[PDB]
Amino acid sequence: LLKRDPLNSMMNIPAVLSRFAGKGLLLSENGYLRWYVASMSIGAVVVLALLMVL
Amino acid sequence: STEVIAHHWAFAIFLIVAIGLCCLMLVGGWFLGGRARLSAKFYLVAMFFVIFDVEALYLFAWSTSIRESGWVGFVEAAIFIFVLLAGLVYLVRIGALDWTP
Amino acid sequence: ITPQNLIALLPLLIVGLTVVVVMLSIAWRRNHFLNATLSVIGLNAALVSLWFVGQAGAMDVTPLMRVDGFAMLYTGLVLLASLATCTFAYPWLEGYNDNKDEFYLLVLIAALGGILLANANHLASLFLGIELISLPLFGLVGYAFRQKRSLEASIKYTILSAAASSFLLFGMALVYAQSGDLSFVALGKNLGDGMLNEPLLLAGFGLMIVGLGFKLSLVPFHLWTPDVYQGAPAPVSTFLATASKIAIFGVVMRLFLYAPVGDSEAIRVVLAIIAFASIIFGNLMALSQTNIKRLLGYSSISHLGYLLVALIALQTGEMSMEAVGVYLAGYLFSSLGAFGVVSLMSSPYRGPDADSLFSYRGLFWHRPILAAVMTVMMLSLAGIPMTLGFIGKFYVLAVGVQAHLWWLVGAVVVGSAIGLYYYLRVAVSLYLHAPPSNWQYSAGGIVVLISALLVLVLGVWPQPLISIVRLAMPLM
Amino acid sequence: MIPLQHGLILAAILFVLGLTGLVIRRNLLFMLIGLEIMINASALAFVVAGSYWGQTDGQVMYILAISLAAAEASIGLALLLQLHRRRQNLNIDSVSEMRG
Amino acid sequence: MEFAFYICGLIAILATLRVITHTNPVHALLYLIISLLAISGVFFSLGAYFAGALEIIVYAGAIMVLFVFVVMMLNLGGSEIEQERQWLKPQVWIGPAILSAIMLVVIVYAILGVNDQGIDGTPISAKAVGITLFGPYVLAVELASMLLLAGLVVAFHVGREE
Ligand SMILES: CCCCCCCCCCCCCCCCCC(=O)OC[C@H](COP(=O)(O)OCCN)OC(=O)CCCCCCCCCCCCCCCCC
Ligand SMILES: CCCCCCCCCCCCCCCCCC(=O)OC[C@H](COP(=O)(O)OCCN)OC(=O)CCCCCCCCCCCCCCCCC
Ligand SMILES: CCCCCCCCCCCCCCCCCCCC
């Protein structure tokens, strides 16, 4: 039951999570200038709202 | 005041009479009578006009208050106009300000 | 206006006179060698004249400008970045069939804007310095406009930087509407008794944060960075990544130092979230990158996140300014060497049609010393000890521990581990197996070798850099 | 007699209109037009702020803003001319080769 | 004063709304020129006489002339864009519109809670603007000359034919 070293796999889990998160984040780098402007305006909205709620 | 509001009224009437005269002229023209790829040099010239127009606005603001700025203002306007003429010489010498090659 | 104030202005005057002289020399004849030499002579002269400005002292040259040792340190970093850019640009521009001389004029004018941002003490001077480093970068990013990727990067950077300039200008206008004074020290002066967090002041600072965080590649204003870095010419990528980031973060450092609204808790929390997201996202997006330009763009996002972590600890700590100085020296040398190795392997410019892929795999077996420099900078940007990048990481960790910024400290550790993965992947790919000849290319190799030796020497022995950064003090 | 808030709100309305025109349009020319709208709105806000306090600084910042607007319009229209020369269309979505 | 300010602000808003939705480029530029004339009228209402004169001279009289020149040069008539009208259907613009509306309402909330003693409207002449511009702001003047120089150099380098 232990021959595959389960503790090593459970400690290897954060590497899998990092690879999945990086692959998911790289989808936003689609190369569209209009989406880049849209993301700038979205970030402006988020920053302004965060500054207003404190 | 009185003279300033009289002049405001006169200027507004001048505006509306001129515009109405032109529009009435075209309306009467339409009424009366019986019926039956450009080169980049244009862009460059217009762009040069824009840049030197903004620099001209700086000189416009300089020219009004000469006797309130002293000799330091003359010095600063002198570096301003020197960079102006340096850019003009740069444009002329490379062929930017020549319609024909 | 005093003549000592004229002594405080010498980097600005020397760079402007170099601009005029190089422009007139181009107007006389188009000589790449002579105009490039005149440009590097003017930049070297301004770097030398920083000593005379240091002997002049420290004073407020205008309601706009203020010069102290803080400003001279930032001016020196910007001038060194510009000199390295010109040195990398000459073997690059040797292959450029169009006019090779406008490059140096734009580089010099951008260095002038960097100097203005180094010395800026005023919203007008900050806006002017931002625009003076931006518009020549519009020209330089698309200097090879016939190349498809360079034209794409030029259009992207121009549109997005015009939008960010509009955001920054609108925020400045709202701040001036509240305050009635464009001086840095008056941004929050008319408030008091706990009424520091005025909503219009905070929203104006938020719009300025949007513009400057675009300029600093901070998440979520970061998506332009890999595309613009990949599409731009490699010396232009070097100049952007070093000079633009250093000058704008220096002026942001100064703005948050003297503005009384810099002690607002809301801006601190927003900048903490931005720093956290920048570190994590920039490290995570560079995991699976086979292109060194995009990888270095994501790396720049993470490193500006670390710098922002050092920025948040400004008011609570005391060593925050020194931390920013030491980190910026290490980052300048590291990014200079990295993008320089990329530049000399991308030199000469092969044309608009041919690919400009780096192909770092197997670099040691045909070009070994540059491979050694490249892996040294990979270790330095990873923050590994024996490198000055570690010394900067240690300073950032010290100011995060002293200010009890535990979330940002944990972000630094986790993003450091992810960075270790991708940086070590690049550094070991340099020594795997894969399937110039003038003195200017040798000068570029000299520049990257010198920067690598400096980062190694100040990794093992960091005390001179610490002492000379501590020598710089502002007019508090 | 004129509130400062009304001038600031008018500038904000023009700014967000320019941002909307920047985002929604595929043609690069209308993107440049929206950029001009946003920078003119920012300059207008600076004029309103300077006029409220009775200072010249608002008009000076207006002059700096329109200098920037002239420079950016020049550079953007040069880039648009280059795009129309190379690709014979002004679709900004086709300029999307770099990604990842 | 207030009366001209409010009509000119309303005209500027309406003209900008026609700008960002129109399909014909020359018509959109004409609406943009109208909005610039209105913004200059707003400047003249505030007392910034130099700013209004510059809004006509520099913005409408130079920059929009450059845009009009470029549009006439390219002969733009909707190359598979007017035939599509992608920006008109709500499934395209419904996102950016509400995003800009949210940003606008946050900015307006920030504006609504400030000190407002009212704009006097006393004319700040171009002579005083010149005294300030060549008094405390001379480094701004010089570096703006270099700014326009940089823009000119960039625009010539990019906008050639060969
Ligand atoms: C016991 C709990 C209490 C003590 C905790 C102590 C924490 C520090 C010490 C332990 C660190 C554990 C790190 C585990 C992952 C190590 C990296 C690794 O395994 O990399 C291998 C893998 C690549 O190999 P391969 O599977 O072939 O993938 C092909 C790639 N295309 O690589 C990849 O696939 C990508 C690797 C990305 C970078 C590594 C992951 C970093 C994640 C954050 C680490 C920091 C600690 C966070 C908390 C961990 C859990 C407690
Ligand atoms: C009539 C109903 C609407 C009809 C459709 C729209 C027509 C155009 C409306 C806008 C332009 C006119 C606005 C009304 C101006 C009337 C005169 C006025 O109110 O003057 C007051 C003031 C005088 O100056 P001041 O010394 O400050 O006096 C204040 C009190 N002592 O004046 C000032 O301070 C400045 C005066 C205004 C600025 C100069 C004129 C600007 C013109 C802008 C035109 C914009 C484009 C129009 C396009 C039309 C088609 C859409
Ligand atoms: C820790 C600080 C940096 C230390 C030096 C890092 C490496 C620099 C380059 C030194 C020379 C490398 C030579 C590698 C030879 C590999 C041969 C492999 C044979 C299978």
The answer to whether E124 faces chain D, any CB pair under 8 Å, is yes
CA-closest candidate to residue C264, choices C146, C325, C175: C175
Distances (CA, A) of A36 to C204, C241, C419: 22, 19, 25
Distances (CA, A) of A37 to B55, C59, C174, C317, D18: 31, 40, 22, 36, 12
What 8-state DSSP symbol labels residue D54?
T
φ/ψ region of B70 (left if φ > 0, alpha if ψ in -120 to 50, else beta) reads: left
Alpha carbon distance C467, E74 (integer Å): 59
Q: At what angle do helices E90-111 and C148-179 cross, to 10 degrees?
A: 30
Residue E60 near ligand 2, beta carbon < 6 Å: no
Distances (CA, A) of A25 to A20, C139, C223, E99: 9, 30, 11, 22
In whole angstroms, how large is the CA radius of gyration of chain E?
Answer: 20
C228-254: b (≥16 Cβ within 10 Å) or e: bbbbbbbbbbbbbbbbbbbbbbbbbbb
Contacting chains of C (3 CB pairs or more, <8 Å) are: A, B, D, E
Structure tokens at C195: 């009424």
Tokens 């003076």 locate to C132
> Could you tell me if E85 and E23 are in contact, meaning their C-beta atoms sit under 8 angstroms apart?
yes
CA-closest candidate to residue C130, choices D71, E101, D37, E11: D71
Alpha carbon distance B21, B15 (integer Å): 10
Q: How big, in percent rounded to 5, are the helix, strand and coil portions of chain D?
A: 80, 5, 15
**Three-class SS state of C67:** strand
- Looking at beta carbons, which residues of chain B come within 8 Å of C20? 82-83, 86
Specified resolution (Å): 2.4
> Could you tell me if C444 and C91 are in contact, meaning their C-beta atoms sit under 8 angstroms apart?
yes
The answer to whether D53 faces chain E, any CB pair under 8 Å, is no
Whose alpha carbon is nearest atom 2 of ligand 3? Answer: C386
What 8-state DSSP symbol labels residue E159?
S
The answer to whether A35 faces chain C, any CB pair under 8 Å, is yes
**Three-class SS state of C122:** strand
Tokens 């909330």 locate to E109
**Three-class SS state of C59:** strand
Taking the C-alpha atoms of D7, D9, D11 and D13 in order, what is their torsion angle to the nearest 10 degrees?
-150
Instruction: Count the Cβ atoms, other than its own, within 10 Å of residue B51.
Output: 26
**Three-class SS state of C156:** helix
Q: Which CATH architecture has domain E1-159?
A: Up-down Bundle (1.20)
Structure tokens at C391: 């010394």
> Could you tell me if C61 and C67 are in contact, meaning their C-beta atoms sit under 8 angstroms apart?
yes
Cβ contacts below 8 Å, chain C against chain D, sum to 123
> Could you tell me if C227 and A37 are in contact, meaning their C-beta atoms sit under 8 angstroms apart?
no
| CA atoms in the 13 A half-sphere facing the CB of C301 | 33
| CA atoms in the 13 A half-sphere facing the CB of C470 | 9
Tokens 């980049």 locate to B40
φ/ψ region of A5 (left if φ > 0, alpha if ψ in -120 to 50, else beta) reads: left
Count H helices and E strands in chain D, helices first: 3, 0
> Could you tell me if C261 and C267 are in contact, meaning their C-beta atoms sit under 8 angstroms apart?
yes
> Could you tell me if C81 and C29 are in contact, meaning their C-beta atoms sit under 8 angstroms apart?
no
**Three-class SS state of D91:** strand
> Could you tell me if D82 and E159 are in contact, meaning their C-beta atoms sit under 8 angstroms apart?
yes
> Could you tell me if C137 and C236 are in contact, meaning their C-beta atoms sit under 8 angstroms apart?
yes
Q: At what angle do helices C148-179 and C123-141 cross, to 10 degrees?
A: 170
The residues after which chain C has a C–N gap greater than 2.5 Å are: 435
Alpha carbon distance E29, E27 (integer Å): 5
Residues C30, C36, C39: CA angle, nearest 5 degrees: 115
Which residues are paired to C183 by β-bridges?
Answer: C122
Q: Are 3 or more Cβ–Cβ pairs between B and A shorter than 8 Å?
A: no
- Domain residues of chain B, as ranges? 10-100
Alpha carbon distance D98, C153 (integer Å): 9
**Three-class SS state of B27:** helix
Ligand 3 centroid–CA C348 distance in Å is 27
Q: What lines the ligand 3 site, CB under 6 Å?
A: C 372, 375-376, 379, 386, 431
Where are the extended beta strands (E) located within C56-186? Answer: none
Distance to chain C for A46, nearest Cα, Å: 10
> Could you tell me if C229 and C237 are in contact, meaning their C-beta atoms sit under 8 angstroms apart?
yes
CA-closest candidate to residue A33, choices D34, C289, C334, B96: D34
Tokens 């008319």 locate to C190
Alpha carbon distance B37, E72 (integer Å): 9
What 8-state DSSP symbol labels residue E62?
I
**Three-class SS state of D2:** strand
Alpha carbon distance C268, C273 (integer Å): 9
DSSP secondary structure of E64-126: HHHHHHHHHHHT-S-SSSTTT-TTTSHHHHHHHHHHHHHHHHHHHHHHTTS----B------H
Alpha-helical runs (H) found in chain B: 3-31, 41-64, 70-94
- Amino acid identity, position C262: G
The answer to whether C195 faces chain B, any CB pair under 8 Å, is no
C278-314: b (≥16 Cβ within 10 Å) or e: bbbbbbbbbbebebbbbbbbbbbbbbbbbbbbbbbbb
Q: Which CATH superfamily is domain B10-100 in?
A: NADH:ubiquinone/plastoquinone oxidoreductase, chain 3 (1.20.58.1610)
> How many residues can be counted in chain C?
476
- Domain residues of chain E, as ranges? 1-159
Contact C135 E147 (CB under 8 A): yes
Q: Which long-range contacts (CB under 8 A, 24 or more apart) does C12-15 make?
A: C12/C112, C12/C115, C12/C116, C12/C119, C12/E139, C12/E143, C14/C42, C14/C45, C14/C46, C14/C49, C15/C42, C15/C43, C15/C46, C15/C108, C15/C111, C15/C112, C15/C115
> Could you tell me if E32 and E39 are in contact, meaning their C-beta atoms sit under 8 angstroms apart?
no
Distance to chain A for C160, nearest Cα, Å: 7
φ/ψ region of A37 (left if φ > 0, alpha if ψ in -120 to 50, else beta) reads: alpha
CA-closest candidate to residue D57, choices C250, C172, A9: C172
- Amino acid identity, position D36: E
Residues E35, E37, E40: CA angle, nearest 5 degrees: 110
Burial of C463 (0-12, 13-18, 19+ CB in 10 A): exposed
Whether the bond between C348 and the residue before it is cis, its omega within 30 degrees of 0, is yes
Distance to chain D for B36, nearest Cα, Å: 41
Alpha carbon distance E60, E50 (integer Å): 14
> Could you tell me if C224 and C152 are in contact, meaning their C-beta atoms sit under 8 angstroms apart?
no
Where are the extended beta strands (E) located within C69-146? Answer: none
> Could you tell me if C433 and C365 are in contact, meaning their C-beta atoms sit under 8 angstroms apart?
yes
Alpha carbon distance D14, E59 (integer Å): 16
Q: Which of E99, E100, E109 comes nearest A52 by C-beta?
A: E109
> Could you tell me if D47 and E55 are in contact, meaning their C-beta atoms sit under 8 angstroms apart?
no
- Looking at beta carbons, which residues of chain A come within 8 Å of E110? 48, 52
This entry's atomic model was obtained through cryo-EM
> Could you tell me if D43 and D69 are in contact, meaning their C-beta atoms sit under 8 angstroms apart?
yes
Taking the C-alpha atoms of E126, E129, E135 and E140 in order, what is their torsion angle to the nearest 10 degrees?
-120
What 8-state DSSP symbol labels residue C434?
-
Alpha carbon distance C312, C400 (integer Å): 9
Distance to chain E for B45, nearest Cα, Å: 9
Alpha carbon distance C121, C116 (integer Å): 9
Domains of chain A: 1-53 (1.20.5.2700)
- Looking at beta carbons, which residues of chain A come within 8 Å of C288? 19, 22-23, 26
Note down the domain range covering C25.
1-476
Domains of chain D: 4-87 (1.10.287.3510)
> Could you tell me if C306 and C399 are in contact, meaning their C-beta atoms sit under 8 angstroms apart?
no
**Three-class SS state of C64:** coil
Based on the structure, what is the number of domains in chain C?
1
